[PDB]
Design a protein around this motif. Structure first.
Motif, short mmCIF file in Angstrom:
data_model
loop_
_atom_site.label_atom_id
_atom_site.label_comp_id
_atom_site.label_asym_id
_atom_site.label_seq_id
_atom_site.Cartn_x
_atom_site.Cartn_y
_atom_site.Cartn_z
N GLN A 165 43.03 31.08 17.43
CA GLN A 165 43.29 32.36 16.32
C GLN A 165 43.54 34.34 17.54
O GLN A 165 44.49 34.59 17.62
N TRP A 166 42.98 34.09 18.76
CA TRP A 166 42.35 34.68 19.77
C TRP A 166 43.53 34.54 20.41
O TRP A 166 44.48 36.50 20.54
N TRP A 167 43.45 33.74 20.85
CA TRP A 167 45.42 34.14 21.55
C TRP A 167 46.64 33.79 21.29
O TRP A 167 47.22 34.61 21.68
N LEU A 168 46.30 33.23 20.17
CA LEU A 168 47.71 33.82 19.37
C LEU A 168 47.78 35.48 18.93
O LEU A 168 49.14 35.11 19.14
N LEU A 169 46.98 36.14 18.60
CA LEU A 169 47.05 37.28 18.86
C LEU A 169 47.15 38.22 19.36
O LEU A 169 48.25 39.13 19.75
N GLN A 170 46.40 37.39 20.75
CA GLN A 170 47.16 38.23 22.24
C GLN A 170 48.69 38.24 22.35
O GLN A 170 49.54 39.20 22.55
N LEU A 171 49.57 36.72 21.90
CA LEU A 171 50.56 36.94 22.19
C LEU A 171 51.55 37.60 21.34
O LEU A 171 52.05 38.14 21.79
N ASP B 257 51.06 35.93 57.88
CA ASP B 257 51.40 36.74 57.65
C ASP B 257 52.29 37.21 56.29
O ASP B 257 52.69 38.29 55.88
N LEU B 258 52.84 36.05 54.74
CA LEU B 258 53.06 36.20 53.92
C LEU B 258 52.28 37.74 53.46
O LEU B 258 51.14 37.43 52.75
N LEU B 259 53.41 38.66 52.73
CA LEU B 259 52.75 39.20 51.75
C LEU B 259 52.98 39.18 50.45
O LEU B 259 54.09 38.49 49.88
N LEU B 260 52.16 39.28 49.87
CA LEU B 260 52.45 39.69 48.11
C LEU B 260 52.30 40.23 47.13
O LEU B 260 51.39 41.64 47.32
N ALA B 261 52.69 40.41 46.21
CA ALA B 261 52.70 40.80 44.96
C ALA B 261 52.54 40.02 43.51
O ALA B 261 53.26 39.51 43.04
N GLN B 262 51.27 40.33 42.97
CA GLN B 262 50.94 40.38 42.02
C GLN B 262 51.74 40.55 40.59
O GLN B 262 51.74 41.29 40.43
N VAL B 263 52.44 39.65 39.70
CA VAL B 263 52.70 40.39 38.41
C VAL B 263 51.61 40.50 37.55
O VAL B 263 50.67 40.54 38.03
N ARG B 264 52.28 42.02 36.88
CA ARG B 264 51.41 42.58 36.10
C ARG B 264 50.67 41.68 34.73
O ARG B 264 51.02 40.71 34.42
N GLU B 265 49.23 41.79 34.64
CA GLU B 265 47.91 41.04 33.05
C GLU B 265 48.54 41.91 32.36
O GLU B 265 47.83 43.07 32.74
N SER B 266 48.69 41.66 30.96
CA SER B 266 48.31 42.43 29.77
C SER B 266 47.49 41.67 28.67
O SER B 266 48.46 40.54 29.03
N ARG B 267 46.52 41.82 28.28
CA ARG B 267 46.01 41.27 27.37
C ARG B 267 46.10 39.65 27.97
O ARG B 267 45.80 38.58 26.83
N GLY B 268 45.42 39.06 28.90
CA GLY B 268 45.35 38.22 29.55
C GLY B 268 45.98 37.51 29.70
O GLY B 268 46.33 36.25 29.99
N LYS B 269 47.40 37.44 29.98
CA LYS B 269 48.69 36.77 30.63
C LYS B 269 49.59 38.19 30.94
O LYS B 269 49.83 38.83 31.03
N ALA B 270 50.47 37.19 32.04
CA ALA B 270 51.46 37.67 32.96
C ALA B 270 52.68 38.21 32.00
O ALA B 270 52.35 38.24 30.31
N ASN B 271 53.01 39.62 32.28
CA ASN B 271 53.06 40.27 31.91
C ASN B 271 54.70 40.75 31.85
O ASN B 271 54.21 41.63 33.05
N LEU B 272 55.97 40.52 32.00
CA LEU B 272 56.82 40.94 32.55
C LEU B 272 57.53 42.22 32.50
O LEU B 272 58.89 42.04 32.78
N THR B 273 57.33 43.20 31.65
CA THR B 273 57.82 43.77 32.01
C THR B 273 58.89 44.91 32.13
O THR B 273 60.02 44.82 32.24
N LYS B 274 58.13 45.02 33.07
CA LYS B 274 58.74 46.10 34.49
C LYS B 274 60.37 45.55 35.49
O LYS B 274 60.78 45.55 36.32
N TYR B 275 59.99 44.12 35.37
CA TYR B 275 61.42 42.98 35.62
C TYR B 275 61.79 43.03 34.25
O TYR B 275 63.86 43.09 34.72
#
Ligand SMILES: Nc1nc2c(ncn2[C@H]2C[C@H](O)[C@@H](COP(=O)(O)NP(=O)(O)OP(=O)(O)O)O2)c(=O)[nH]1
Ligand SMILES: [Mn+2]
Ligand SMILES: [Mn+2]
Length: 430
Positions: free
Chosen positions: A336-342, A77-95
């Motif tokens: 190059q694409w991932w360097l740009l995302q980061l 019965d574990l409930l799960l919340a997922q970290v936001r994803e932005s530009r293809g990666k985890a985004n921890l801005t909310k925390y």
DNA sequence: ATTATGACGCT
DNA sequence: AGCGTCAT
């Protein structure tokens, strides 16, 4: 004897938010409150990786580092919340924003040292002197310490957890000498009163609960904080240290959980922190180096001098992403694409930092890992950070790493990259 | 295939 | 400066 300084000059607290990312998600979504809940990053591989666990879920064995699919085996019965994803990666801005909420409240009581996203040290020495002046020798009522444990008590001459807590607090308060404004035990006690107030303010103004430790230095305050989580605070006095350390595995002390702690255990043939007292300072320096040896000699006696740094803001702002197994980057277009995302996430966080905090980063650190290397970083290179522009930052990062590609082909990247990391450092006031 | 960070010591 | 350790 009389000249033997005892490391009792300061009052230091460590405040640590309980299951922080879970509490942030539970505030936002009331359906998650008071339930076995965890926070995950990503989802496709094994249900995502758990990074935070509510105390209800911990009762079932769910832990940090567990895959969500395996956690669901322990707790269906574990409930799960997922970290936001932005530009293809985890985004921890909310925390990070929730963290700023808490740190700003703490800073009302004293200058703080931000030690992580969810915890800060507080030097309460001066605030304690002030509250002691106000008390005018008045004793401290147990009513002012409604969530405080006194480590090591009760002792000597009882079935419920709260009853034990109050018993120990009563023994502690009855032994206090309140006519002495320089008594370290009294000072710690007043410090704990202040921390009750700080934790009350945090919960009232954010909805977040936290635990805390109060002692004479940072290491003991951190250890204290852990003893009675969640939603409680613990006072570790100087006098409680011999008994506490006599059965304390060396690895529980912050900084001894790795290779150095293992070497202490193996070289000296000991298991517990208290056993270190039998060695001379020179013996410990001879095994572990001058600095570590002096630190161990003092720390096993409850003494540590590391100051609470006046620093509420992170010293660096960084962005990183792993590319495990078959997702490792093997073309120049990919890298190059991932360097740009980061770099675009970095630019957004840096621009917000400059607006909020009146400072500018001046150095960009680029770290990569290459396939087949077990180390965290395979290579670190710095360059100048002169503009908050993601395209320039990603081009510069490419320029400083491009000599890594052992492929003769221009298009292919070999061997493939399993990690990219961009870190802005060396801030200057702007 | 834990992952995303961040702090700090060493040489 | 670039690398290693510790943390979580
Ligand atoms: N991205 C990421 N975040 C992490 C990781 N480990 C922890 N966090 C995040 C998620 C955590 O919520 C937060 C604070 O870390 P703690 O104080 O060590 N754990 P907590 O507050 O959950 O529980 P407790 O009541 O025992 O203090 O850091 C990680 O490996 N990666
Ligand atoms: Mn915490
Ligand atoms: Mn923490």
């Amino acid at each position: 004897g009389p000249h033997m300084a005892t490391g009792q000059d300061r009052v230091v607290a460590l405040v640590d938010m309980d299951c922080f990312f879970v509490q942030v998600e539970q505030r936002q979504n009331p359906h998650l409150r008071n339930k076995p809940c965890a926070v995950v990053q990503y989802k496709s591989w094994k249900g995502g990786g758990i990074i935070a666990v509510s105390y209800e879920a911990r009762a079932f064995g769910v832990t940090r580092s567990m895959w969500a699919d395996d956690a669901k085996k322990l707790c269906p019965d574990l409930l799960l919340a997922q970290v936001r994803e932005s530009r293809g990666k985890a985004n921890l801005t909310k925390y990070r924003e929730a963290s700023v909420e808490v740190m700003e409240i703490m800073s009302r009581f004293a200058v703080i040292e931000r030690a992580s996203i969810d915890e800060a040290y507080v030097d309460l020495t001066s605030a304690v002197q002030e509250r002691l002046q106000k008390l005018q020798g008045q004793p401290i009522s147990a009513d002012l310490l409604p969530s405080t444990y006194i480590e090591g008590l009760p002792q000597g001459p009882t079935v419920q957890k709260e009853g034990m807590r109050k018993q120990g607090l009563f023994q502690w308060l009855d032994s206090l000498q309140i006519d002495n404004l320089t008594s370290p035990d009294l000072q710690l006690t007043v410090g704990a009163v202040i921390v009750e107030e700080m934790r009350a303010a945090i919960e009232r103004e954010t909805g977040f609960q936290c635990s805390a430790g109060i002692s004479h230095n940072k290491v003991l305050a951190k250890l204290a904080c852990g003893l009675n989580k969640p939603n409680r605070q613990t006072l570790v006095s100087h006098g409680s240290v011999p008994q506490l350390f006599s059965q304390m595995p060396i690895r529980k002390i912050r900084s001894l959980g790795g290779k150095l702690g293992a070497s202490v255990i193996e070289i000296l043939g000991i298991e517990y922190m208290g056993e270190l007292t039998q060695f001379t300072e020179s013996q410990l320096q001879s095994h572990f180096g001058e600095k570590n040896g002096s630190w161990l000699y003092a720390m096993c006696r409850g003494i540590e001098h590391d100051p609470v740094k006046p620093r509420q803001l992170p010293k660096t702002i960084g962005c990183s992403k792993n590319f495990p197994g078959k997702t490792a980057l093997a073309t120049r277009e990919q890298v190059q694409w991932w360097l740009l995302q980061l770099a675009q996430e970095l630019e957004e966080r840096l621009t917000k930092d400059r607006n909020d905090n009146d400072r500018v980063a001046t150095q960009l650190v680029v770290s990569i890992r290459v396939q087949g290397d077990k180390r965290l970083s395979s290579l670190r290179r710095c360059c100048a950070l002169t503009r908050y522009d993601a395209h320039k930052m990603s081009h510069d990062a490419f320029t400083v790493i491009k000599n890594c590609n052992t492929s003769g082909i221009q298009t292919e990247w070999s061997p493939p990259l399993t990690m990219l990391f961009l870190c802005a450092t060396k801030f200057s006031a702007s």
